[PDB]
Amino acid sequence: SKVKVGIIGGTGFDDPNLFKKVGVRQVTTPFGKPSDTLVEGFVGDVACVVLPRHGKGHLIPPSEVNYRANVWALKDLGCTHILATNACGSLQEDLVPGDFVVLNQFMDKTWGRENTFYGSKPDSLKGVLHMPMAEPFCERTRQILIQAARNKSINVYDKKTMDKSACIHPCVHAEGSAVTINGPRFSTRCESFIHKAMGLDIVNMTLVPEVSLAREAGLSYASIAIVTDFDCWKHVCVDMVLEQFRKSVVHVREILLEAVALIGAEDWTKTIEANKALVMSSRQDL
Amino acid sequence: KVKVGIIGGTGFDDPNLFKKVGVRQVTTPFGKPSDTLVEGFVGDVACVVLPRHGKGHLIPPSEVNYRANVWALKDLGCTHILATNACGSLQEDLVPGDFVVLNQFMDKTWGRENTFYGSKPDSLKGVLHMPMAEPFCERTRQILIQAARNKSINVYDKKTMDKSACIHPCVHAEGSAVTINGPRFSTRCESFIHKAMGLDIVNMTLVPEVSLAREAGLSYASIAIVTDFDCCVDMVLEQFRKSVVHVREILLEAVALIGAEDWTKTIEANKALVMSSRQDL
Amino acid sequence: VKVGIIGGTGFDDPNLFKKVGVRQVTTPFGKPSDTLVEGFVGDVACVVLPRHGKGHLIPPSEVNYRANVWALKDLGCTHILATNACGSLQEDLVPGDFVVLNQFMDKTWGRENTFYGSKPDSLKGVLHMPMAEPFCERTRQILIQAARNKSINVYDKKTMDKSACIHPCVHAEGSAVTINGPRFSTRCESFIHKAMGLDIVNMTLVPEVSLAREAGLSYASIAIVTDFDCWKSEEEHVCVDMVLEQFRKSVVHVREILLEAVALIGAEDWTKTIEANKALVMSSRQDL
C-alpha cells in the first residue's frame, strides 16, 4: 500500500527543484552506478525520489545512460511509480513546439544498450523474462498525467474524441507514439520522412529501454514528452526555441508535482500486485 | 552420407527424439554451444540434437551462441540442420496451431555474433559476403513440407490455392518472419508496422542461425510453430503442446526423407557458395 | 584546401597521381585501415586511404571509421571524397552508373559512430549534430560538374525524362540504405527497402559520412552501381567476369571524376564554408 514516486528528469531537469532535500543517496546497483546521486524527499505527504537521467552537467549521452542502474536504484529505494520527462522532435503537423505528449506507444530503433535485467551472463538476474509490451505504459499513471494537466489549466487535446479544430496550442496530447532513435545524431530527411509515413508522432532518444526496464522491475511508468524544435539551422531562432522550452519546463514541473499528489490520493494495491505478478508470469525458465 | 542436426527451440528443451547412443560435451573456436549434443539414429540416418536455449531454458535469444551451435554440428559432420522456432502471428490467415516452413525473413536483430569471418584475430580470415536473397536450402524446405503431408497435416500454398483451402491447423508452404532481438515482445505500434510491411510472423531466434548455417556450408530449413503470446493461457498452452507433438512427427519423417536421397551435388554446391563469396580471394 | 580520398572496393591499391610517399599515422581512436598515399593534383595537396586496407581484408562492420576520418582531419584535410560500391534498388539505376548521394537511411549497428561521449576512449562531451541534409552540398555539386567536364552523362530525375537517361550516367541525387553486412539482403528485405523509395544499398557510407561532419570536414560520396546477383545466371563464371570487367571500367571513370573534382575544389574559395563546418560542430555541443 506504500506509494512512492520516482522521477527521472531529462533535458531541462539536470538539477530539478521539485522539493526540499531530505536525503541524498549515493547508491550502487548490481548493474553499476546510476547517472547521479538520488535525492529523496516529500511532495505533500507522498515520498518522492528524483534522478537526472543525463547526470549533473548533462555529460552522459542517450546511448551511454545506465538505464538498468537508474531503474534498479529507484526500485531499491521503494519507488512504486516512475514519472519521466523527455525532449522530442515533432513528426506530424498537429504536434508543434510547446506542446506536450503523454505517450502511449513507441517504435524502438535503439541498439547497443543494456535493455533487460535477466539473462544467462554473470552480471544479470537468473532467468529468461519475456514481458508483454503491447501497451507499454501504465495506463492509470498515464491518465494521472493528463488529469494533472487539466488540473493546472493546460489545454488537453484528445484526437480520439475531439475534432482537430479543437487542437489549441499549447496543448497536452492525450496519446501519441514515439520513435526512439539511438543518437547522438539527428535523423536525415530520408529517415524522418519514413518515420512520419509509418504514422509516428515524435522522435526521441531516451524512452527505450527505460520504459521496458520499469515494467521488468514491477513499477508503474509513464512519460511526458516536451515537443521542442531542433531545426533552427534553417539565427535568433535558438533563443526563441530556448525561451519556449524554458516555459515548457515550468509547466511540466507543475504537471509532475500535481501528478505526484494525485498518485498519493488513490489506492494502488491491486495495480502493484498486478505489476509484480506480470513479472512472475513472464518468466519462461519458470 | 548425410547427418542431420536438429536445433530444438521452445518446447524442445528436452527433445527425446530417439534413443540416446552417445553424448558430446564439446566447445568450439567461438565458445560453448547451448548444451551437450545428443547423438543417435532415425532408422539408419545419423542425427544430432541440441536445445537452442539449453536444458531448463536458461539462455535468452540474444545470448544464444549461434556461432558455437552451428560450428559444433559442423564439427560432428552434420550436412543438414533442421530448426524449430516458436512465433507469433502478424496476419489473419496464420492462426495459433499452424506451422510455417519459412522462405524469407526481415532482420531486426543486433548485438549478436553473426559471421565466422572477418579481420579480428579470433575470426576465420577473409571477407565473406554471402548471398541471402532466398536464404534457406530449398530442397530441405520441400522435404519439411512433404514430411508434413506424409504425417496427415494440411498444407496451404497461397500462391496456388484460394483462401478457402486454408484449413486449420495447416503448414503454410511459404512465409516471412521478422526476427526481433527481444527479450520483450513488440508494442502494438511495432506489430502494426511489421504487419503493414507484409511480414507473416515474428520470432527472436531465426537470425543469425540461418545465416551461419549457410556460412558453414550446411543445408538449413526452419519450421515455425504459430502460438499466441499476447493473451486463456490454458488453451494456448495445450494447443502448443499439440503443435510440439506435430513438429516432432514432421522432424522424424523429415530425417528419414533426407537419408532416402543422394545429396552429393547439393553439399558440394553448399561448399562452393562459401568459396565464391570470399571477396578477399 | 586539402582533399582526402577514401577509396572503397576497386581502390585498394590506389594509383591516382604521381605518388610522393606513403605515410603511417596513429589517431586517438586507433590506427586507420592502412597507410596513406600523399601527393598532389596540380597545386592541391591530396591524400588517399583504402577503406578496406590493402588486400581488402577488413569488412564493412570492422572498419575503424573514426580513425580513418580523424587521420585525414589531423593531416589538414578540408574535404573528403569517398567511393562506395553498391547494388541498385530501382529500375533506372543499372550497373555501370554512378550516384552522387544526397540522402541515406541507416541500418548499421555496433560501429563506433561518434567521436564524443563519457567513456575514456572518446572525446569529452555530448554532440548532437543535425543531419537533415547530411552531405556538403557544394562538394556534391563539384563531383557532378567534374563528371560533366569528363563527358560523363548526368541524369537528374527531377528535371529529365527517364527515356532521356543515357547510360552509363551519374545520377544527380539518390538515397542509400546502409546495411551492416557482411551478408547481402534477403528478397524480403530488398522489397521493403525498395518500397520505402530507397535508390541503392551499400555497407560503408555510415558512420563515415556522420563522422566527417563531426570532424568539421566537407564530405561527398560517389557510389558505383555494380551487380551482386550473378548467382542467378546459369553461367555464373562468365557473369562474374563480365561484371568484374564492367566494374573495372567504372573505376577508371571514377578516378577521372575524382582527379577533376580535386582541381575544381582547389580553384574556389572555401573560407566561409570551412568556418561554417567548424561552428556547426561547436553549436551542436549540448553539454556546453
Residue numbers in the entry:
A (entry chain B): 2 to 235, 240 to 291
B (entry chain C): 3 to 233, 242 to 291
C (entry chain A): 4 to 291
Provide the authors' original text about this structure.
Because the S. mansoni genome does not codify an adenosine phosphorylase, one alternative to fulfilling this activity is 5´-deoxy-5´-methylthioadenosine phosphorylase (E.C. 2.4.2.28) (MTAP). This enzyme catalyzes the reversible phosphorolysis of 5´-deoxy-5´-methylthioadenosine (MTA) to free adenine and 5´-deoxy-5´-methythioribose-1-phosphate (MTR1P). The observed overall fold of SmMTAP is similar to that of members from NP-1 family of low-molecular weight purine nucleoside phosphorylases (PNP), which consist of a central β-sheet distorted barrel surrounded by α-helices, as observed in other MTAPs from human and bacteria. Furthermore, a comparison of the KM levels reveals that S. mansoni MTAP can use adenosine with the same efficiency as MTA, which is one fundamental difference between S. mansoni and its host and reveals a potential target for schistosomiasis drug development.
A disulphide bond between residues C233 and C242 was observed in the APO structures of S12T, N87T and S12T/N87T mutants. SmMTAP structures displaying this SS bond also have the gate loop locked in open form. It remains to be characterized why there is a preference for the formation of such bonds in these mutants and the biological relevance (if any) of this SS bond. In general, residues 229–242, which comprise the catalytic residue D230 and the gate loop, are disordered in subunits without ligands. In APO structures, E230 usually points away from the active site, and F231 occupies part of the base binding site (BBS); this movement involves the reorientation of both the main and side chains. The presence of the mutation S12T does not alter the phosphate loop compared to the SmMTAP WT structures. Intriguingly, the results show an increase of 158X in the PO4 KM for the S12T mutant.
